[PDB]
Amino acid sequence: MTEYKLVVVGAGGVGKSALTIQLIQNHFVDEYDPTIEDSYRKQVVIDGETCLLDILDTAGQEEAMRDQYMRTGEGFLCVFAINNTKSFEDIHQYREQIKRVKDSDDVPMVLVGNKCDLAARTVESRQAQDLARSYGIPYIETSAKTRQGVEDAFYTLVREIRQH
């Protein structure tokens, strides 16, 4: 079957792991346990197609080894939190990093605004839409806590790879 290698990138504490684990195990991780390196594998059916998802959950805090997995990945989930302006601003650097490694401006990506269950919003939807538009990618809001948009974020990333 088709195997999609997805890489989840973004600043620390935005909910990269919470999203991934919610997708894999339908469980919300309430605690904050910073990631070093975590890979997950899941067999799913996306649009009538039996898919094998290989997902790499990366470290937000520093750490290099980034270039290594950025060459492997076919699709990138760029995550920020809507209650974390700085994390949203860091997205550009992640995009540039992916752009350099793959030497392309046509890398399958999806911009993800997480923690949409919170009312402490400092990043407006329109702002993120503009950022995504400049990259040529979709923008999706999610909540790993309420499962909102989670499947949609990942499945959209698969469908973006299919276009490329």
């Binding site: 684990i21 894999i24 195990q25 469980h27 070093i36 390196e37 975590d38 890979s39 594998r41």
Partner: protein, 78 residues
């Protein structure tokens, strides 16, 4: 400061765990296995020996995890 252990999981998955004072091998791999739909009491865990390629030494789940800091482990099915 780096008190970590690289672990190769079944189905070609992998994780790096953090080790803290008093943790057993079971206590530091508990979460990583659960979220991937695996029970510890269904898997054998091994240490991959230095200076070789395939050298595999079986461990006990109640082993102090501090003893394995900086090492690479492998979890398999039974």
């Amino acid at each position: 400061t780096s008190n970590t252990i690289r672990v190769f999981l079944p189905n070609k998955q992998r994780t790096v765990v953090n080790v803290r004072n008093g943790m057993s091998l079971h206590d530091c791999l508990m979460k990583a296995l659960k979220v991937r739909g695996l029970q510890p009491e269904c898997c054998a865990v091994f240490r991959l020996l230095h200076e070789h390629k395939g050298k595999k030494a079986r461990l006990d789940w109640n082993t102090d995890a501090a003893s394995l800091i900086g090492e690479e482990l492998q979890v398999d099915f039974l």
